[PDB]
Design a binder for this molecule. Structure first.
Ligand SMILES: Cc1cc2nc3c(=O)[nH]c(=O)nc-3n(C[C@H](O)[C@H](O)[C@H](O)COP(=O)(O)OP(=O)(O)OC[C@H]3O[C@@H](n4cnc5c(N)ncnc54)[C@H](O)[C@@H]3O)c2cc1C
Ligand SMILES: Cc1cc2nc3c(=O)[nH]c(=O)nc-3n(C[C@H](O)[C@H](O)[C@H](O)COP(=O)(O)OP(=O)(O)OC[C@H]3O[C@@H](n4cnc5c(N)ncnc54)[C@H](O)[C@@H]3O)c2cc1C
Ligand SMILES: Cc1ccc2[nH]cc(C[C@H](N)C(=O)O)c2c1
Ligand SMILES: Cc1ccc2[nH]cc(C[C@H](N)C(=O)O)c2c1
Ligand SMILES: [Mg+2]
Ligand SMILES: [Mg+2]
Lengths: 417, 417
């Protein structure tokens, strides 16, 4: 038999937290747990790396707030991961536009119906012209704020939940932390605890289809070396994001919820140097938000710098990387010089660098349904779906922990019934 | 994105050698050349690994014969790669069957003038018992020899061109060498020459489809992070195996050749230990061929041991691996113990271990003796296909060198004219 009592497809933080809750319940004594992930390492969009062997960098999720993410903070403490303060919470190098509109976003506050749920750009186009509104939105360095299906209501929550811009709203007392060893240390601790409790991991296998087979389910998987594999299970959680769900044969989203779902790409690029040349400019631990394509530039201590972009600007950088390392590094240097107000020859070339493009970096519900529960259920088959996108914290690890707790509750009802 | 004058998809030894022949030619001065491969490193089924940092192992190709592979030996010398004697050229702990293997193969050979081209299993059981034929073929370690479409003709060619069993057909004239640093070193030599001459590499991109587009071709590729990419070229070599050709939209194999093609899976597992325990059995640099699922067991000096299987036996192990690393490792201990005639508890567990499964390890002409030309051309579009499977040396790097030389001539004649 290649079978299991419970199967979790997905070994990001959502899936591994489902596993951890299930194995804690005495109702799962003796039941067997199999965890699939198409990747070769657990973590999903949590991916920590040593750059040049020197320092530790976050290619995916990198920061959290005690105010916004208390379940995440508790997870870090439960698994004894040490946090460090996250420095990039203020813009010391502000602009007239960035100054102007902290004051300007209080005014438009009456958006219940007067502005409602328009686009954020359509909204702000009201207070001042369309031109002025573009420059205001651009100065916050998250290009997703320009998209039409990003409502003005959404946008205000987006802006107050991000550390670089949170001072423009009344979320300016939120505190922020990063992992010292990287969030992968947390992924590793959960994984080890779930393995020691007897769950078995099959990493490197991609789920392709699932069919209901009697009381349980039949899964078709493809290993990344081509090996085709079938698995029977009695209970199934799909701890994968909406974009992955749509690729299956399970009638997503219609058989699952009222809502439609969307996603933004993200891009991060990291560079290290022979000397921490930015210390002369008093830039260590500062973040610059610029209109040029780097958009958000970060100087981490004396160790490295990086930049972070989304939507069309993430696709720009990913395209320019496809045309080869050389023009990519040269474009970066130009835009670094422009952001500092110096000539490109004062920017050294880097020793090492690494980048990462996430085609579906953030996945979110456009709130079409009236209510939206934390985990999902197939109306017919009883498959449970689990993802940060189904919660009040879409786009955050905290949403993963919250979806997983509901997801494991729903599955514990399936055993008790 | 952009374009090229010449495009090579596939950066195994075929594609790299194609590129090398093309850039040697004055007829390409000024032409741009772009090379795609879906893997992140060049080499294809040539994959070397410094297992532990103190030993070089070959997960793909591992040995060549100067007598059978003169072009490959010449390539090694051209790129200044050092060879070393390949130890596993004979068997010592021969069982009862493995002596009769010689005198029966030398005796059953006149009968292959007639009833020669039939299946090898049913030809060997047409002059000895069938219970005797299954024992004689199995003692050769290669389960390819039990299959319908491998003739008694094409099986005598296999037995004589393989180092472990070439004694069985009076082909000990043939010496065998391995690469001192691995065949990766040859791959890196070609790659460096092709880069130094201006070819542009795009690794990590998978070709999904090609369509003719005026004089040239429009290629659709998918990066392994999702990034979709369109590339326009004027001349196009597909240096990929027949299994890869079928996955495209190019009417393979009809619009190319009158031969049909098959493939076999292969599996290798490598095990290292704290103590070279197998020396007490005088096993270093020896190879045992056994009935049990390990089939061929190799002891490399006092560095490591490994085993090598094909066909159904390769699929046996890949399934075992899918059910979990612990049951796989315990299976190996069992089959090692019975092979050496000792109890399980005298085999240690391994420190480190690695394994590779090749779903299409070998691909070959099955309309064999079609006088199959060394490269193919699409009857309509003029796309050239390059692969070891199109040559007399299907299954050897030598075949890739031969196919590459032809494919580049085809493309130079069509670049000219
Ligand atoms: C660049 C970037 C920066 C981020 N920064 C932050 C931050 O600072 N703070 C924060 O809270 N969040 C951040 N996030 C988001 C955070 O990473 C996610 O919210 C969280 O990791 C999602 O966890 P998950 O388990 O729900 O999904 P995922 O992490 O996406 O894991 C899903 C897993 O399912 C696997 N999988 C998918 N599909 C299939 C299939 N068909 N078969 C098999 N297996 C499959 C995938 O391999 C994946 O490992 C960031 C994300 C990105 C891209
Ligand atoms: C286990 C094993 C042991 C072997 N031992 C020996 C030996 O000892 N002696 C010997 O001579 N030979 C041996 N071989 C054979 C040798 O590996 C091959 O004959 C040779 O490497 C084939 O080279 P190639 O360039 O034709 O094809 P490949 O090495 O198969 O290269 C094909 C390349 O094209 C890429 N590719 C494919 N498809 C697509 C697509 N749609 N888009 C983009 N890219 C793509 C692949 O990723 C790959 O890099 C062995 C093979 C195996 C599997
Ligand atoms: C551009 C964008 C838009 C909406 C978003 N919701 C959550 C995130 C992740 C955040 N940017 C982070 O990295 O912590 C995010 C990003
Ligand atoms: C089983 C089988 C059948 C046919 C084959 N033609 C070439 C090879 C490669 C060889 N076995 C090696 O590993 O060097 C091979 C293998
Ligand atoms: Mg998950
Ligand atoms: Mg090739």
């Amino acid at each position: 038999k290649h079978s299991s009592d419970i199967c979790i497809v997905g070994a990001g933080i959502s899936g591994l937290t489902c596993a951890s809750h299930l194995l804690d319940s005495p109702a799962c004594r003796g039941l067997s747990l199999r965890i699939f992930d198409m990747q070769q390492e657990a973590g999903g969009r949590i991916r920590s790396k040593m750059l040049d062997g020197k320092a530790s960098i976050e290619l995916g999720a990198g920061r959290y707030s005690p105010q916004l993410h208390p379940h995440f903070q508790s997870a870090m403490q439960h698994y004894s991961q040490k946090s460090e303060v996250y420095p990039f919470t203020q813009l010391k190098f502000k602009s007239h536009v960035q100054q102007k509109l902290k004051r300007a976003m209080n005014e438009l506050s009456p958006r219940l119906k007067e502005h409602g749920k328009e686009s954020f750009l359509q909204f702000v186009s009201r207070y001042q012209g369309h031109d002025s509104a573009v420059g205001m939105i651009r100065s916050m360095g998250y290009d997703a704020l320009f998209l039409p299906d990003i409502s003005a209501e959404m946008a205000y929550d987006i802006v107050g939940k991000h550390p670089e811009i949170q001072s423009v709203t009344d979320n300016d007392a939120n505190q922020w932390f990063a992992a010292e060893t990287g969030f992968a240390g947390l992924i590793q601790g959960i994984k080890a605890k779930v393995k020691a409790a007897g769950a078995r991991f099959s990493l490197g296998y991609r789920l392709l289809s699932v069919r209901t087979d009697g009381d349980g389910y039949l899964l078709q998987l493809a290993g990344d070396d081509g090996w085709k594999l079938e698995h029977r299970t009695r209970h199934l959680i799909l701890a994968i994001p909406p974009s992955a769900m749509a690729g299956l044969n399970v009638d997503f989203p219609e058989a699952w919820s009222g809502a439609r779902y969307g996603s933004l790409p993200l891009f991060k690029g990291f560079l290290t140097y022979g000397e921490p040349w930015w210390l002369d400019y008093k830039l260590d631990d500062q973040v610059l938000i610029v209109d040029n394509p780097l958009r958000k530039i970060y100087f981490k201590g004396d160790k490295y710098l990086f930049f972070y972009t989304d939507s069309e600007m993430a696709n720009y950088w990913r395209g320019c990387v496809a045309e080869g390392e050389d023009g990519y590094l040269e474009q970066i240097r130009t835009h670094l010089a422009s952001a500092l107000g110096i000539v490109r020859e004062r920017i050294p070339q880097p020793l090492a660098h690494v980048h990462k493009y996430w085609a579906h970096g953030v996945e979110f519900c456009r709130d079409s349904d009236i209510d939206h529960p934390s985990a999902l259920s197939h109306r017919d088959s009883g498959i449970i779906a689990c993802s940060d996108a189904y919660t009040e914290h879409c786009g955050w690890m905290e949403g993963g922990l919250l979806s997983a707790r509901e997801a494991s509750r729903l599955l514990l009802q399936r055993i008790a019934a």
